[PDB]
Amino acid sequence: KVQTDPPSVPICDLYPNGVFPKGQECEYPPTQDGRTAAWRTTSEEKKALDQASEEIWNDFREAAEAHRQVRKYVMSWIKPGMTMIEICEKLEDCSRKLIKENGLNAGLAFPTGCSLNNCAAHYTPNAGDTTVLQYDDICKIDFGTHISGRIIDCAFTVTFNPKYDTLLKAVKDATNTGIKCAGIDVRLCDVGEAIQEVMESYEVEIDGKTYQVKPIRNLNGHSIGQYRIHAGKTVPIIKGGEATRMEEGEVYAIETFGSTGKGVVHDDMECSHYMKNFDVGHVPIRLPRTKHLLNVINENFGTLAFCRRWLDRLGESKYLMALKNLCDLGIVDPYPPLCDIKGSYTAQFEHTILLRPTCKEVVSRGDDY
Ligand SMILES: Cc1ccc(NS(=O)(=O)c2ccccc2)c(C(=O)O)c1
Ligand SMILES: [Mn+2]
Ligand SMILES: [Mn+2]
Secondary structure, rough: OOOOOOOOOOOHHHOOOOOOOOEEEEEEOOOOOOOOOOOOOHHHHHHHHHHHHHHHHHHHHHHHHHHHHHHHHHHHOOOOOOOHHHHHHHHHHHHHOOOOOEOOOEEEEEEEEEEEEEEEEOOOOOOOOOOOOOOOOOEEEEEEEEEEEEEEEEEEEEEEHHHHHHHHHHHHHHHHHHHHOOOOEHHHHHHHHHHHHHHHEEEEOOOOOEOEEEEOOOEEEEEEEEEEEOOOEEOOOOOOOOEEEEEOOOOOEEEEEEEEOOOOEEEEEOOOOEEEEEOOOOOOOOOOOHHHHHHHHHOOOOOOEEEEEHOOOOOOOOHHHOOOOOOOOEEEEEEEEEEEEEEEEEOEEEEEEOOOOEEEEEEEOOOOO
């Protein structure tokens, strides 16, 4: 009863029983008294709690399998010479098909980030962007999928010149350290301190200059909520930050960013990412164009992030002022590209993890990273 598998068959159609593959399952890290998590691994009480939200975990897994298959595909063809628009459209086209896009029930969780070099996040081309990926570019591919609002935020870094190899290794190791440190009752600040320690243990040499990799201090991981990419809690990336503990049942985006610059990002370049304020309720709007755009946003994205290209594909035109109005009203928030100093290089690696009652599941883990 098999069939096609190349990037064209929806993940849902690949599993008739509706049960999707689990990600990497890890035992929760010990504590002071060396209290391991071997007991919680099968605990009858926890096993029940976990099984109670099996439908939720399952949805994350379906979205994760889509993410794994989409990215494996992307890595096979992304090459310098392609425009950033060509890259994002080809990736998104596949993502939409594998996730079996269905309105707000299944689809793309957020725009395809493809931030270059000193820019670390939130850059995706808008219409007319002629930017071309270069051999020496360090591109952060950050895209998301979701099933019923259960979001998979996962990212990796693309390079073609081996000179960035140790920088990527540093960030990948830092992210895996954060993933290993994460757990129920674990203080967020400890995760950040652990991440910084690993990150900074790496020194790299690029074009004759040496650098001690720096975590981007004002960037971080975050808890994830249904249809809410950033539920409220933040996972630092450096020491001294977040005096809160991770809790059972929570879901986190564990990401780290390393940089050869100041280790700080600032808003720069034209904005492409936007997202309705999760807390803003219904707001009556009479302005025709603004009213229509808000309706389009509510129908197609809800509280999920979107980009200008996604408005263009829906047939919307000359909507910039309306979009600005929504932002000025506080109904929608702009999320411009976040970049370090000109000339610097930034790298990123990210995974979504489920803090399940019985274990810690790195649901987006793959054979690649
Ligand atoms: C639109 C949007 C809103 C919030 C987000 N989460 S975040 O603020 O913790 C964040 C994380 C990493 C880079 C930049 C921002 C993200 C995201 O995880 O990138 C995207
Ligand atoms: Mn991300
Ligand atoms: Mn994230």
